[model samples]
Target chain A: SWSWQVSLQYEKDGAFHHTCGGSLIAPDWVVTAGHCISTSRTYQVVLGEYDRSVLEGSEQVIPINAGDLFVHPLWNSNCVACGNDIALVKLSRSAQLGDKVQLANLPPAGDILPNEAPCYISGWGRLYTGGPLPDKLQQALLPTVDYEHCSQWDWWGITVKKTMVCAGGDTRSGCNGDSGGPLNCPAADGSWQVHGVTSFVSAFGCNTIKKPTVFTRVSAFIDWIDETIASN
Target chain B: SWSWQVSLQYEKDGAFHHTCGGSLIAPDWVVTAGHCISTSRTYQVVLGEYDRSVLEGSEQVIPINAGDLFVHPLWNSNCVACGNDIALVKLSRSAQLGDKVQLANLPPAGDILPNEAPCYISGWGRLYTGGPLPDKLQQALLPTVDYEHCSQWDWWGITVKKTMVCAGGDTRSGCNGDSGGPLNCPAADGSWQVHGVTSFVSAFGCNTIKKPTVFTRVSAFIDWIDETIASN
Candidate 1:
């Protein structure tokens, strides 16, 4: 259902396997979480992927060099709550924009989604906590949680920063392997915009009530993303 | 979109005005909330209704007498949490089941929906709390909340009984005038079944963070419904 959705794969044994989700923000650029990239591991970005089990003939796998992968400077693996969890990946070649591949629309600079605004989160993650992963990409309606509510004492509190957006305090949420995926929200023009980059779920468990899944607000880092892409 | 959806109208100043929503379970039997009926008021059931403001050719208006209206004996108007909030209203004649008028499919007895199971709640209710009522019917996705989470102290607490089902603790939820409407859940056969009867919402607000809209579990009252219809 998400044409811009791409899988961040790591070379394992002799083949590449999906490790995290990414969004094709441009023809040769992708947006993912900073934690998804490792300096030592060989990575590849697979576009036009639907089912991970069998080859559906639409996948385009492009190998990435370590120099092309850019993790935010402020991103600290030790402290996930410190913010700056976004990253950019440059493809070897520009992906052909077609039915299976398209650019993800980014939200306007500094736009904050209202409380309880409906958005979709899609990935090839586990169906539930400690549940089996699905072959096909799964999507769920995860309403946005406002800063005031998400930062309350009983909720994420100080861990949730203004640079991040929270969603799905209910049963449906983003889990492991869903990290680095785009949180798609429908614009007034009927186009789906990439508002948030999937960052982390609660330490308690995936889909924990009152904890919610947190994401790096793409709108908050628009200037950083533009500068990074232009300079590179 | 619900063919079985009917509007319970009360006669005021020689004009019938919509008071609550109901479901046509049988040709002559309409199910609603016990709180919808009043002994002094004359009522009518409007079938095949879509827009309330405009005159629709498909609408079928059937007058209901006081003797034909049956409110559950266990229902207490003073006690909102006592539980049996279901009621049945008999039509003067059988409504023709056609393109715009149909019987609501009911769930099996004692059938409890799984936690976070997707369901739909539709009615001609207000857009939001203190908002203007819609002339056309409005529908929203309200994923079912299991007894365990709904009965929690921070949630509905003891107010959410086993005979009740909670849904839509998020933004999209049933508002005022949605009472007595059907909570439609898709069955295994891909057909929608009437699993809940709209009862009450939190006194705090229409769509409270942890307080979902409560409904009378239709499956729990299947035996009482069958017996009441058979005797009437």
Candidate 2:
């Protein structure tokens, strides 16, 4: 459960602060939203932390500055609901993997889990709409909706895309600050793998009944992820 | 033992990021170093975290923002060695007291532990001077050093004070990133109480031979703590 959690922190006055959430695909690399990546302010990744506030007796928190950052070519920050909404951040230092720290596995090529499959979403975002943020990391079990059904006229209409995965038609969802976090589903061998990156929510609010939370389909970006990390 | 832990966080890109270390005194107040204060920058405090990275099944982290920040009037950030390094931050939200999340008791009217008393110093600071930061919280059993011997010519000479307590002469001392944490000793009833705040290390280096690490004596600042919290 400790594998692949990322704290997207941005540098301000004299210290780095938690900005958003993300997924750790490698020891030195994390994946987040392209909008958050577009900021000119200095940002870093905090690895191996669950609760941002509490320090455990035997555990410590590790922070890594973003040495190199990349946003997908198709992502446009102005159009928040547009198709592409993913980015990758590389840490200046290599992460020291341990019991409380690990990597989140990327999806297999062309992989798409069946609709209604149970997927878990985790982040340190706000509890409800405009609510006080949780002291601990929060997770919710949201079921998936296939692309065709999610893109129907009564659903997200034309704004949603095949490159996105939709979840939630119930009370649970990712709220105001949950961007760039992971949507994890079980792998064939039973280990969890990240299939989506939290992208956008409906205009009505975060927990709309019909407007399921949408995430960027990670499988569709495997080529871009690998190519970007290799080139830059 | 239930009180006296703090989460040092910084602000970046409009979010609070946990950074340094300190202790929880009042449910809504924290005692830290002065240099880490004095900024208008955004920051907050986290409580009840055992591991900074992973969320445990049983525990939750509570974070409180500094509604008001106060640095010791005498501390001038430039010199690491010239004394008076203390600060108290009031948490914006009153902390919820529990077993995993509790407050450390302030000294009972200028109390001082006997020499060689069992005091445990803990933090996510460096393992060695200029060395790699550790992934787990580190603690050392450092005995108390009275001001008399600590101020001798061979020791700190004149810098030591009744307002300061020294410890860690047996090849153990505070290293980088340990500032603003607590130096705690056992109470007469066997429970632990924080007596010192990690301040400065010796001129020789961290973990030096015969040169002990020093902490700002918490007992001397009882008035300042109570008054500041009231005035602010």
lDDT by residue (B1-232, candidate 1, tens digit) is 4455578877766676565687888899999988778768899887764533332445677899779889999998667788899999999999876565346788899999999999987765521111123345656688998999999887889888999988877444344226677888888888778888878775322343467888899999999999999999
Question: For candidate 2, what is the DockQ-based docking class?
Answer: incorrect
lDDT of 2 by residue, B108-141 (tens): 8688878887788776442111112233455667
lDDT of 2 by residue, A82-186 (tens): 768898888786776655544678898678878888998876442111112333555668888888878877777787888889987544443422666788888
Candidate 2, A63: how far from true, in Å? 6.2
Q: List the residue pairs that clash in candidate 1.
A: none
lDDT of 1 by residue, A44-91 (tens): 887754533332446676889888998998998657888888899999
Interface RMSD, per-candidate values to 1 decimal: 16.8, 20.8
Looking at model 1, give its docking quality level: incorrect
Note the Cα lDDT for every prediction shown. 0.74, 0.65
Q: After superposition, how far is residue B125 of candidate 2 from its true place, in Å?
A: 32
lDDT score for residue A91 of model 2:
75
